[PDB]
Amino acid sequence: KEIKNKAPQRWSQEWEVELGIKVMTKVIELGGTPTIGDCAVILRAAVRAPMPSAFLNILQTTHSLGYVFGSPLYDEIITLCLDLGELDAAIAIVADLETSGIKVPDETLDRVISARQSSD
Protein backbone atom coordinates (compact mmCIF):
# COMPACT_ATOMS: atom_id res chain seq x y z
CA LYS A 1 0.00 0.00 0.00
CA GLU A 2 2.70 2.50 0.82
CA ILE A 3 5.27 1.67 -1.82
CA LYS A 4 2.96 2.01 -4.81
CA ASN A 5 1.94 5.67 -4.35
CA LYS A 6 5.21 7.02 -2.92
CA ALA A 7 6.96 9.78 -4.84
CA PRO A 8 10.11 8.61 -6.64
CA GLN A 9 13.57 9.76 -5.56
CA ARG A 10 15.72 11.49 -8.16
CA TRP A 11 19.10 10.07 -9.14
CA SER A 12 22.31 11.23 -7.47
CA GLN A 13 25.87 9.97 -7.82
CA GLU A 14 26.31 10.03 -4.04
CA TRP A 15 23.36 7.67 -3.58
CA GLU A 16 24.81 5.71 -6.51
CA VAL A 17 28.17 5.10 -4.84
CA GLU A 18 26.40 4.35 -1.54
CA LEU A 19 24.29 1.67 -3.23
CA GLY A 20 27.42 0.40 -4.99
CA ILE A 21 29.45 -0.04 -1.80
CA LYS A 22 26.44 -1.63 -0.10
CA VAL A 23 26.04 -4.10 -2.98
CA MET A 24 29.77 -4.86 -2.80
CA THR A 25 29.59 -5.48 0.96
CA LYS A 26 26.59 -7.77 0.47
CA VAL A 27 28.28 -9.69 -2.36
CA ILE A 28 31.38 -10.18 -0.21
CA GLU A 29 29.21 -11.32 2.70
CA LEU A 30 27.33 -13.86 0.56
CA GLY A 31 30.58 -15.41 -0.67
CA GLY A 32 31.09 -13.59 -3.97
CA THR A 33 34.27 -12.03 -5.32
CA PRO A 34 33.91 -8.75 -7.24
CA THR A 35 36.25 -8.07 -10.14
CA ILE A 36 38.95 -5.40 -10.14
CA GLY A 37 37.14 -3.65 -12.99
CA ASP A 38 34.03 -3.00 -10.91
CA CYS A 39 36.32 -1.58 -8.22
CA ALA A 40 37.93 0.80 -10.71
CA VAL A 41 34.42 1.70 -11.89
CA ILE A 42 33.18 2.59 -8.41
CA LEU A 43 36.39 4.55 -7.85
CA ARG A 44 35.64 6.48 -11.05
CA ALA A 45 32.07 7.09 -9.88
CA ALA A 46 33.43 8.35 -6.55
CA VAL A 47 35.97 10.70 -8.15
CA ARG A 48 33.48 12.06 -10.70
CA ALA A 49 31.19 13.48 -8.00
CA PRO A 50 32.93 14.93 -4.91
CA MET A 51 32.82 12.24 -2.21
CA PRO A 52 36.12 11.89 -0.34
CA SER A 53 34.73 9.87 2.58
CA ALA A 54 34.03 6.80 0.42
CA PHE A 55 37.63 6.59 -0.84
CA LEU A 56 39.04 4.91 2.27
CA ASN A 57 36.33 2.25 2.49
CA ILE A 58 36.33 1.47 -1.24
CA LEU A 59 40.12 1.08 -1.34
CA GLN A 60 40.00 -1.06 1.81
CA THR A 61 37.43 -3.30 0.11
CA THR A 62 39.66 -3.52 -2.97
CA HIS A 63 42.72 -4.41 -0.89
CA SER A 64 40.63 -6.95 1.05
CA LEU A 65 40.28 -9.30 -1.92
CA GLY A 66 43.99 -8.90 -2.68
CA TYR A 67 43.66 -6.50 -5.62
CA VAL A 68 46.22 -3.72 -6.07
CA PHE A 69 45.79 -0.73 -8.37
CA GLY A 70 48.54 1.13 -10.17
CA SER A 71 50.40 4.12 -8.80
CA PRO A 72 48.65 6.68 -11.09
CA LEU A 73 45.22 5.85 -9.65
CA TYR A 74 46.37 6.32 -6.06
CA ASP A 75 48.16 9.50 -7.16
CA GLU A 76 44.94 10.78 -8.71
CA ILE A 77 42.76 10.02 -5.68
CA ILE A 78 45.31 11.56 -3.29
CA THR A 79 45.63 14.66 -5.48
CA LEU A 80 41.84 15.00 -5.52
CA CYS A 81 41.69 14.62 -1.73
CA LEU A 82 44.32 17.36 -1.40
CA ASP A 83 42.58 19.62 -3.91
CA LEU A 84 39.06 19.41 -2.45
CA GLY A 85 40.39 20.15 1.05
CA GLU A 86 40.09 16.73 2.74
CA LEU A 87 43.55 16.60 4.29
CA ASP A 88 42.68 14.10 7.04
CA ALA A 89 41.17 11.84 4.37
CA ALA A 90 44.43 11.81 2.40
CA ILE A 91 46.35 11.20 5.63
CA ALA A 92 44.19 8.15 6.36
CA ILE A 93 44.63 7.03 2.74
CA VAL A 94 48.43 7.15 2.86
CA ALA A 95 48.35 5.52 6.30
CA ASP A 96 46.35 2.50 5.15
CA LEU A 97 48.38 2.35 1.93
CA GLU A 98 51.60 2.16 3.96
CA THR A 99 49.96 -0.46 6.18
CA SER A 100 49.02 -2.59 3.16
CA GLY A 101 52.58 -2.33 1.84
CA ILE A 102 51.94 -0.84 -1.60
CA LYS A 103 54.40 1.73 -2.97
CA VAL A 104 53.00 5.22 -3.61
CA PRO A 105 54.83 7.77 -5.80
CA ASP A 106 57.39 9.92 -4.02
CA GLU A 107 55.90 13.22 -5.22
CA THR A 108 52.49 12.22 -3.83
CA LEU A 109 53.90 11.53 -0.36
CA ASP A 110 55.92 14.74 -0.58
CA ARG A 111 52.77 16.73 -1.36
CA VAL A 112 50.94 14.98 1.49
CA ILE A 113 53.73 15.90 3.91
CA SER A 114 53.71 19.49 2.63
CA ALA A 115 49.94 19.75 3.12
CA ARG A 116 50.25 18.27 6.61
CA GLN A 117 52.94 20.81 7.51
CA SER A 118 50.87 23.66 6.08
CA SER A 119 47.78 22.58 8.04
CA ASP A 120 49.73 22.34 11.31
Side-chain angles (χ1 to χ4, degrees), residues 25-48:
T25 303
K26 246 56 185 62
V27 166
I28 295 179
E29 175 64 27
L30 275 305
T33 157
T35 62
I36 327 176
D38 109 297
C39 298
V41 146
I42 64 166
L43 260 74
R44 289 274 288 99
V47 301
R48 276 183 301 181

mmCIF file with all atom_site columns, all heavy atoms in Angstrom, residues 25-48:
data_model
loop_
_atom_site.group_PDB
_atom_site.id
_atom_site.type_symbol
_atom_site.label_atom_id
_atom_site.label_alt_id
_atom_site.label_comp_id
_atom_site.label_asym_id
_atom_site.label_entity_id
_atom_site.label_seq_id
_atom_site.pdbx_PDB_ins_code
_atom_site.Cartn_x
_atom_site.Cartn_y
_atom_site.Cartn_z
_atom_site.occupancy
_atom_site.B_iso_or_equiv
_atom_site.pdbx_formal_charge
_atom_site.auth_seq_id
_atom_site.auth_comp_id
_atom_site.auth_asym_id
_atom_site.auth_atom_id
_atom_site.pdbx_PDB_model_num
ATOM 1   N N   . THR A 1 25 ? 29.532 -4.867  -0.366  1.00 0.00 ? 25 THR A N   1
ATOM 2   C CA  . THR A 1 25 ? 29.592 -5.484  0.956   1.00 0.00 ? 25 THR A CA  1
ATOM 3   C C   . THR A 1 25 ? 28.693 -6.711  1.027   1.00 0.00 ? 25 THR A C   1
ATOM 4   O O   . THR A 1 25 ? 29.086 -7.748  1.576   1.00 0.00 ? 25 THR A O   1
ATOM 5   C CB  . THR A 1 25 ? 29.200 -4.472  2.031   1.00 0.00 ? 25 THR A CB  1
ATOM 6   O OG1 . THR A 1 25 ? 30.063 -3.330  1.950   1.00 0.00 ? 25 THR A OG1 1
ATOM 7   C CG2 . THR A 1 25 ? 29.320 -5.091  3.417   1.00 0.00 ? 25 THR A CG2 1
ATOM 8   N N   . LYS A 1 26 ? 27.488 -6.620  0.460   1.00 0.00 ? 26 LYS A N   1
ATOM 9   C CA  . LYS A 1 26 ? 26.589 -7.770  0.472   1.00 0.00 ? 26 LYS A CA  1
ATOM 10  C C   . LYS A 1 26 ? 27.160 -8.926  -0.342  1.00 0.00 ? 26 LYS A C   1
ATOM 11  O O   . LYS A 1 26 ? 27.120 -10.080 0.097   1.00 0.00 ? 26 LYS A O   1
ATOM 12  C CB  . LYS A 1 26 ? 25.212 -7.368  -0.053  1.00 0.00 ? 26 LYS A CB  1
ATOM 13  C CG  . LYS A 1 26 ? 24.114 -7.430  0.997   1.00 0.00 ? 26 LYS A CG  1
ATOM 14  C CD  . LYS A 1 26 ? 24.455 -6.576  2.206   1.00 0.00 ? 26 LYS A CD  1
ATOM 15  C CE  . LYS A 1 26 ? 23.417 -6.732  3.306   1.00 0.00 ? 26 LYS A CE  1
ATOM 16  N NZ  . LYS A 1 26 ? 23.339 -8.134  3.803   1.00 0.00 ? 26 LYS A NZ  1
ATOM 17  N N   . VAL A 1 27 ? 27.717 -8.636  -1.521  1.00 0.00 ? 27 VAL A N   1
ATOM 18  C CA  . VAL A 1 27 ? 28.279 -9.693  -2.360  1.00 0.00 ? 27 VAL A CA  1
ATOM 19  C C   . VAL A 1 27 ? 29.439 -10.375 -1.648  1.00 0.00 ? 27 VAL A C   1
ATOM 20  O O   . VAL A 1 27 ? 29.581 -11.603 -1.697  1.00 0.00 ? 27 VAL A O   1
ATOM 21  C CB  . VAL A 1 27 ? 28.704 -9.122  -3.726  1.00 0.00 ? 27 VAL A CB  1
ATOM 22  C CG1 . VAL A 1 27 ? 29.581 -10.116 -4.472  1.00 0.00 ? 27 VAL A CG1 1
ATOM 23  C CG2 . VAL A 1 27 ? 27.480 -8.775  -4.557  1.00 0.00 ? 27 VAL A CG2 1
ATOM 24  N N   . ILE A 1 28 ? 30.279 -9.595  -0.965  1.00 0.00 ? 28 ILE A N   1
ATOM 25  C CA  . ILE A 1 28 ? 31.383 -10.183 -0.210  1.00 0.00 ? 28 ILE A CA  1
ATOM 26  C C   . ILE A 1 28 ? 30.853 -11.024 0.944   1.00 0.00 ? 28 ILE A C   1
ATOM 27  O O   . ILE A 1 28 ? 31.402 -12.088 1.262   1.00 0.00 ? 28 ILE A O   1
ATOM 28  C CB  . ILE A 1 28 ? 32.341 -9.080  0.278   1.00 0.00 ? 28 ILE A CB  1
ATOM 29  C CG1 . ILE A 1 28 ? 33.015 -8.401  -0.915  1.00 0.00 ? 28 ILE A CG1 1
ATOM 30  C CG2 . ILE A 1 28 ? 33.387 -9.651  1.225   1.00 0.00 ? 28 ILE A CG2 1
ATOM 31  C CD1 . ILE A 1 28 ? 33.958 -7.285  -0.530  1.00 0.00 ? 28 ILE A CD1 1
ATOM 32  N N   . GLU A 1 29 ? 29.769 -10.573 1.582   1.00 0.00 ? 29 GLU A N   1
ATOM 33  C CA  . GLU A 1 29 ? 29.207 -11.322 2.702   1.00 0.00 ? 29 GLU A CA  1
ATOM 34  C C   . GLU A 1 29 ? 28.619 -12.651 2.243   1.00 0.00 ? 29 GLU A C   1
ATOM 35  O O   . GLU A 1 29 ? 28.746 -13.667 2.935   1.00 0.00 ? 29 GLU A O   1
ATOM 36  C CB  . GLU A 1 29 ? 28.142 -10.482 3.408   1.00 0.00 ? 29 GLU A CB  1
ATOM 37  C CG  . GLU A 1 29 ? 27.407 -11.210 4.522   1.00 0.00 ? 29 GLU A CG  1
ATOM 38  C CD  . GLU A 1 29 ? 28.321 -11.606 5.665   1.00 0.00 ? 29 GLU A CD  1
ATOM 39  O OE1 . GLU A 1 29 ? 29.345 -10.922 5.876   1.00 0.00 ? 29 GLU A OE1 1
ATOM 40  O OE2 . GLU A 1 29 ? 28.017 -12.604 6.351   1.00 0.00 ? 29 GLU A OE2 1
ATOM 41  N N   . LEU A 1 30 ? 27.982 -12.664 1.076   1.00 0.00 ? 30 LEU A N   1
ATOM 42  C CA  . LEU A 1 30 ? 27.326 -13.858 0.562   1.00 0.00 ? 30 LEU A CA  1
ATOM 43  C C   . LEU A 1 30 ? 28.289 -14.817 -0.123  1.00 0.00 ? 30 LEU A C   1
ATOM 44  O O   . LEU A 1 30 ? 27.847 -15.835 -0.666  1.00 0.00 ? 30 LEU A O   1
ATOM 45  C CB  . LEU A 1 30 ? 26.205 -13.465 -0.408  1.00 0.00 ? 30 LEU A CB  1
ATOM 46  C CG  . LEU A 1 30 ? 24.837 -13.144 0.205   1.00 0.00 ? 30 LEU A CG  1
ATOM 47  C CD1 . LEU A 1 30 ? 24.364 -14.302 1.059   1.00 0.00 ? 30 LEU A CD1 1
ATOM 48  C CD2 . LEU A 1 30 ? 24.848 -11.862 1.022   1.00 0.00 ? 30 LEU A CD2 1
ATOM 49  N N   . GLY A 1 31 ? 29.586 -14.523 -0.107  1.00 0.00 ? 31 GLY A N   1
ATOM 50  C CA  . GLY A 1 31 ? 30.578 -15.407 -0.674  1.00 0.00 ? 31 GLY A CA  1
ATOM 51  C C   . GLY A 1 31 ? 30.978 -15.121 -2.103  1.00 0.00 ? 31 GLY A C   1
ATOM 52  O O   . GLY A 1 31 ? 31.527 -16.014 -2.761  1.00 0.00 ? 31 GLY A O   1
ATOM 53  N N   . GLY A 1 32 ? 30.733 -13.914 -2.604  1.00 0.00 ? 32 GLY A N   1
ATOM 54  C CA  . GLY A 1 32 ? 31.086 -13.591 -3.972  1.00 0.00 ? 32 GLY A CA  1
ATOM 55  C C   . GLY A 1 32 ? 32.287 -12.675 -4.066  1.00 0.00 ? 32 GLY A C   1
ATOM 56  O O   . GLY A 1 32 ? 32.515 -11.847 -3.180  1.00 0.00 ? 32 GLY A O   1
ATOM 57  N N   . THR A 1 33 ? 33.059 -12.809 -5.141  1.00 0.00 ? 33 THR A N   1
ATOM 58  C CA  . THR A 1 33 ? 34.271 -12.029 -5.318  1.00 0.00 ? 33 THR A CA  1
ATOM 59  C C   . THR A 1 33 ? 34.100 -11.038 -6.456  1.00 0.00 ? 33 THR A C   1
ATOM 60  O O   . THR A 1 33 ? 34.022 -11.445 -7.623  1.00 0.00 ? 33 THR A O   1
ATOM 61  C CB  . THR A 1 33 ? 35.469 -12.948 -5.597  1.00 0.00 ? 33 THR A CB  1
ATOM 62  O OG1 . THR A 1 33 ? 36.492 -12.217 -6.285  1.00 0.00 ? 33 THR A OG1 1
ATOM 63  C CG2 . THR A 1 33 ? 35.045 -14.148 -6.434  1.00 0.00 ? 33 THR A CG2 1
ATOM 64  N N   . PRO A 1 34 ? 34.029 -9.741  -6.163  1.00 0.00 ? 34 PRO A N   1
ATOM 65  C CA  . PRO A 1 34 ? 33.909 -8.753  -7.240  1.00 0.00 ? 34 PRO A CA  1
ATOM 66  C C   . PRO A 1 34 ? 35.209 -8.637  -8.021  1.00 0.00 ? 34 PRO A C   1
ATOM 67  O O   . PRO A 1 34 ? 36.293 -8.910  -7.502  1.00 0.00 ? 34 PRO A O   1
ATOM 68  C CB  . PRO A 1 34 ? 33.585 -7.450  -6.497  1.00 0.00 ? 34 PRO A CB  1
ATOM 69  C CG  . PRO A 1 34 ? 33.120 -7.880  -5.135  1.00 0.00 ? 34 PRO A CG  1
ATOM 70  C CD  . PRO A 1 34 ? 33.883 -9.130  -4.833  1.00 0.00 ? 34 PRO A CD  1
ATOM 71  N N   . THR A 1 35 ? 35.088 -8.237  -9.282  1.00 0.00 ? 35 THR A N   1
ATOM 72  C CA  . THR A 1 35 ? 36.252 -8.073  -10.137 1.00 0.00 ? 35 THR A CA  1
ATOM 73  C C   . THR A 1 35 ? 36.946 -6.744  -9.851  1.00 0.00 ? 35 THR A C   1
ATOM 74  O O   . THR A 1 35 ? 36.383 -5.838  -9.231  1.00 0.00 ? 35 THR A O   1
ATOM 75  C CB  . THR A 1 35 ? 35.855 -8.147  -11.611 1.00 0.00 ? 35 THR A CB  1
ATOM 76  O OG1 . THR A 1 35 ? 34.954 -7.076  -11.920 1.00 0.00 ? 35 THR A OG1 1
ATOM 77  C CG2 . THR A 1 35 ? 35.175 -9.474  -11.911 1.00 0.00 ? 35 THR A CG2 1
ATOM 78  N N   . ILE A 1 36 ? 38.193 -6.637  -10.313 1.00 0.00 ? 36 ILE A N   1
ATOM 79  C CA  . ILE A 1 36 ? 38.946 -5.398  -10.138 1.00 0.00 ? 36 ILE A CA  1
ATOM 80  C C   . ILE A 1 36 ? 38.345 -4.286  -10.988 1.00 0.00 ? 36 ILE A C   1
ATOM 81  O O   . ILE A 1 36 ? 38.442 -3.099  -10.648 1.00 0.00 ? 36 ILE A O   1
ATOM 82  C CB  . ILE A 1 36 ? 40.432 -5.622  -10.471 1.00 0.00 ? 36 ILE A CB  1
ATOM 83  C CG1 . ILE A 1 36 ? 40.855 -7.042  -10.095 1.00 0.00 ? 36 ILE A CG1 1
ATOM 84  C CG2 . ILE A 1 36 ? 41.298 -4.606  -9.745  1.00 0.00 ? 36 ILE A CG2 1
ATOM 85  C CD1 . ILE A 1 36 ? 42.277 -7.379  -10.490 1.00 0.00 ? 36 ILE A CD1 1
ATOM 86  N N   . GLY A 1 37 ? 37.727 -4.651  -12.114 1.00 0.00 ? 37 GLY A N   1
ATOM 87  C CA  . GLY A 1 37 ? 37.143 -3.645  -12.985 1.00 0.00 ? 37 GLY A CA  1
ATOM 88  C C   . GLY A 1 37 ? 35.978 -2.918  -12.346 1.00 0.00 ? 37 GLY A C   1
ATOM 89  O O   . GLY A 1 37 ? 35.837 -1.702  -12.495 1.00 0.00 ? 37 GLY A O   1
ATOM 90  N N   . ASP A 1 38 ? 35.127 -3.647  -11.620 1.00 0.00 ? 38 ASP A N   1
ATOM 91  C CA  . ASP A 1 38 ? 34.031 -2.996  -10.909 1.00 0.00 ? 38 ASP A CA  1
ATOM 92  C C   . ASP A 1 38 ? 34.566 -2.075  -9.820  1.00 0.00 ? 38 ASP A C   1
ATOM 93  O O   . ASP A 1 38 ? 33.974 -1.029  -9.529  1.00 0.00 ? 38 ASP A O   1
ATOM 94  C CB  . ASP A 1 38 ? 33.077 -4.046  -10.332 1.00 0.00 ? 38 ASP A CB  1
ATOM 95  C CG  . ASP A 1 38 ? 33.150 -4.148  -8.818  1.00 0.00 ? 38 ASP A CG  1
ATOM 96  O OD1 . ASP A 1 38 ? 34.219 -4.512  -8.287  1.00 0.00 ? 38 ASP A OD1 1
ATOM 97  O OD2 . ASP A 1 38 ? 32.132 -3.859  -8.157  1.00 0.00 ? 38 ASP A OD2 1
ATOM 98  N N   . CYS A 1 39 ? 35.693 -2.448  -9.210  1.00 0.00 ? 39 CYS A N   1
ATOM 99  C CA  . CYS A 1 39 ? 36.322 -1.584  -8.219  1.00 0.00 ? 39 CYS A CA  1
ATOM 100 C C   . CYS A 1 39 ? 36.831 -0.296  -8.856  1.00 0.00 ? 39 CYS A C   1
ATOM 101 O O   . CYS A 1 39 ? 36.618 0.799   -8.320  1.00 0.00 ? 39 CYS A O   1
ATOM 102 C CB  . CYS A 1 39 ? 37.459 -2.333  -7.529  1.00 0.00 ? 39 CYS A CB  1
ATOM 103 S SG  . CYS A 1 39 ? 36.932 -3.810  -6.629  1.00 0.00 ? 39 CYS A SG  1
ATOM 104 N N   . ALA A 1 40 ? 37.501 -0.404  -10.006 1.00 0.00 ? 40 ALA A N   1
ATOM 105 C CA  . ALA A 1 40 ? 37.926 0.800   -10.714 1.00 0.00 ? 40 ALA A CA  1
ATOM 106 C C   . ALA A 1 40 ? 36.725 1.637   -11.135 1.00 0.00 ? 40 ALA A C   1
ATOM 107 O O   . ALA A 1 40 ? 36.783 2.872   -11.132 1.00 0.00 ? 40 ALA A O   1
ATOM 108 C CB  . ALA A 1 40 ? 38.777 0.427   -11.928 1.00 0.00 ? 40 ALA A CB  1
ATOM 109 N N   . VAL A 1 41 ? 35.612 0.980   -11.467 1.00 0.00 ? 41 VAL A N   1
ATOM 110 C CA  . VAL A 1 41 ? 34.416 1.701   -11.894 1.00 0.00 ? 41 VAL A CA  1
ATOM 111 C C   . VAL A 1 41 ? 33.808 2.478   -10.733 1.00 0.00 ? 41 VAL A C   1
ATOM 112 O O   . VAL A 1 41 ? 33.395 3.634   -10.893 1.00 0.00 ? 41 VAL A O   1
ATOM 113 C CB  . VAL A 1 41 ? 33.405 0.722   -12.521 1.00 0.00 ? 41 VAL A CB  1
ATOM 114 C CG1 . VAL A 1 41 ? 31.987 1.147   -12.213 1.00 0.00 ? 41 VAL A CG1 1
ATOM 115 C CG2 . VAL A 1 41 ? 33.609 0.652   -14.022 1.00 0.00 ? 41 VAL A CG2 1
ATOM 116 N N   . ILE A 1 42 ? 33.741 1.868   -9.547  1.00 0.00 ? 42 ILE A N   1
ATOM 117 C CA  . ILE A 1 42 ? 33.176 2.590   -8.408  1.00 0.00 ? 42 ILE A CA  1
ATOM 118 C C   . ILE A 1 42 ? 34.128 3.688   -7.952  1.00 0.00 ? 42 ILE A C   1
ATOM 119 O O   . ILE A 1 42 ? 33.694 4.742   -7.476  1.00 0.00 ? 42 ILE A O   1
ATOM 120 C CB  . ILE A 1 42 ? 32.811 1.632   -7.256  1.00 0.00 ? 42 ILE A CB  1
ATOM 121 C CG1 . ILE A 1 42 ? 34.052 0.954   -6.679  1.00 0.00 ? 42 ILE A CG1 1
ATOM 122 C CG2 . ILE A 1 42 ? 31.786 0.607   -7.713  1.00 0.00 ? 42 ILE A CG2 1
ATOM 123 C CD1 . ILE A 1 42 ? 33.805 0.268   -5.357  1.00 0.00 ? 42 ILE A CD1 1
ATOM 124 N N   . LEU A 1 43 ? 35.437 3.478   -8.118  1.00 0.00 ? 43 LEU A N   1
ATOM 125 C CA  . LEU A 1 43 ? 36.385 4.555   -7.845  1.00 0.00 ? 43 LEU A CA  1
ATOM 126 C C   . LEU A 1 43 ? 36.173 5.724   -8.803  1.00 0.00 ? 43 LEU A C   1
ATOM 127 O O   . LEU A 1 43 ? 36.228 6.891   -8.400  1.00 0.00 ? 43 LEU A O   1
ATOM 128 C CB  . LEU A 1 43 ? 37.821 4.036   -7.933  1.00 0.00 ? 43 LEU A CB  1
ATOM 129 C CG  . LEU A 1 43 ? 38.521 3.717   -6.607  1.00 0.00 ? 43 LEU A CG  1
ATOM 130 C CD1 . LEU A 1 43 ? 37.991 2.431   -5.993  1.00 0.00 ? 43 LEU A CD1 1
ATOM 131 C CD2 . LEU A 1 43 ? 40.027 3.644   -6.801  1.00 0.00 ? 43 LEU A CD2 1
ATOM 132 N N   . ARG A 1 44 ? 35.930 5.426   -10.081 1.00 0.00 ? 44 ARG A N   1
ATOM 133 C CA  . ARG A 1 44 ? 35.643 6.480   -11.047 1.00 0.00 ? 44 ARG A CA  1
ATOM 134 C C   . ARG A 1 44 ? 34.344 7.203   -10.716 1.00 0.00 ? 44 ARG A C   1
ATOM 135 O O   . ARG A 1 44 ? 34.263 8.431   -10.847 1.00 0.00 ? 44 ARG A O   1
ATOM 136 C CB  . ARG A 1 44 ? 35.584 5.892   -12.457 1.00 0.00 ? 44 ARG A CB  1
ATOM 137 C CG  . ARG A 1 44 ? 36.936 5.472   -13.007 1.00 0.00 ? 44 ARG A CG  1
ATOM 138 C CD  . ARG A 1 44 ? 37.659 6.637   -13.669 1.00 0.00 ? 44 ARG A CD  1
ATOM 139 N NE  . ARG A 1 44 ? 37.043 7.012   -14.940 1.00 0.00 ? 44 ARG A NE  1
ATOM 140 C CZ  . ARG A 1 44 ? 36.189 8.019   -15.094 1.00 0.00 ? 44 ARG A CZ  1
ATOM 141 N NH1 . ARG A 1 44 ? 35.845 8.767   -14.054 1.00 0.00 ? 44 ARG A NH1 1
ATOM 142 N NH2 . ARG A 1 44 ? 35.680 8.282   -16.290 1.00 0.00 ? 44 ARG A NH2 1
ATOM 143 N N   . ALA A 1 45 ? 33.322 6.462   -10.286 1.00 0.00 ? 45 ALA A N   1
ATOM 144 C CA  . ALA A 1 45 ? 32.070 7.092   -9.880  1.00 0.00 ? 45 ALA A CA  1
ATOM 145 C C   . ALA A 1 45 ? 32.273 7.971   -8.653  1.00 0.00 ? 45 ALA A C   1
ATOM 146 O O   . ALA A 1 45 ? 31.618 9.009   -8.506  1.00 0.00 ? 45 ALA A O   1
ATOM 147 C CB  . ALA A 1 45 ? 31.008 6.027   -9.610  1.00 0.00 ? 45 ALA A CB  1
ATOM 148 N N   . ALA A 1 46 ? 33.178 7.568   -7.758  1.00 0.00 ? 46 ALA A N   1
ATOM 149 C CA  . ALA A 1 46 ? 33.427 8.349   -6.552  1.00 0.00 ? 46 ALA A CA  1
ATOM 150 C C   . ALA A 1 46 ? 34.250 9.597   -6.852  1.00 0.00 ? 46 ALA A C   1
ATOM 151 O O   . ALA A 1 46 ? 34.105 10.619  -6.172  1.00 0.00 ? 46 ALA A O   1
ATOM 152 C CB  . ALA A 1 46 ? 34.125 7.484   -5.502  1.00 0.00 ? 46 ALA A CB  1
ATOM 153 N N   . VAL A 1 47 ? 35.141 9.529   -7.844  1.00 0.00 ? 47 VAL A N   1
ATOM 154 C CA  . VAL A 1 47 ? 35.966 10.697  -8.155  1.00 0.00 ? 47 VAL A CA  1
ATOM 155 C C   . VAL A 1 47 ? 35.213 11.668  -9.058  1.00 0.00 ? 47 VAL A C   1
ATOM 156 O O   . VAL A 1 47 ? 35.499 12.872  -9.067  1.00 0.00 ? 47 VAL A O   1
ATOM 157 C CB  . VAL A 1 47 ? 37.314 10.275  -8.769  1.00 0.00 ? 47 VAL A CB  1
ATOM 158 C CG1 . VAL A 1 47 ? 38.085 9.380   -7.810  1.00 0.00 ? 47 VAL A CG1 1
ATOM 159 C CG2 . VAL A 1 47 ? 37.118 9.601   -10.116 1.00 0.00 ? 47 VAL A CG2 1
ATOM 160 N N   . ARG A 1 48 ? 34.246 11.169  -9.838  1.00 0.00 ? 48 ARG A N   1
ATOM 161 C CA  . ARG A 1 48 ? 33.476 12.061  -10.702 1.00 0.00 ? 48 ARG A CA  1
ATOM 162 C C   . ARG A 1 48 ? 32.679 13.074  -9.887  1.00 0.00 ? 48 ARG A C   1
ATOM 163 O O   . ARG A 1 48 ? 32.731 14.278  -10.162 1.00 0.00 ? 48 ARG A O   1
ATOM 164 C CB  . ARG A 1 48 ? 32.547 11.255  -11.609 1.00 0.00 ? 48 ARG A CB  1
ATOM 165 C CG  . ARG A 1 48 ? 33.209 10.723  -12.871 1.00 0.00 ? 48 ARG A CG  1
ATOM 166 C CD  . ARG A 1 48 ? 32.206 10.001  -13.754 1.00 0.00 ? 48 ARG A CD  1
ATOM 167 N NE  . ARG A 1 48 ? 31.582 8.876   -13.066 1.00 0.00 ? 48 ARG A NE  1
ATOM 168 C CZ  . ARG A 1 48 ? 30.677 8.072   -13.617 1.00 0.00 ? 48 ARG A CZ  1
ATOM 169 N NH1 . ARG A 1 48 ? 30.290 8.269   -14.869 1.00 0.00 ? 48 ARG A NH1 1
ATOM 170 N NH2 . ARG A 1 48 ? 30.161 7.070   -12.918 1.00 0.00 ? 48 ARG A NH2 1
#
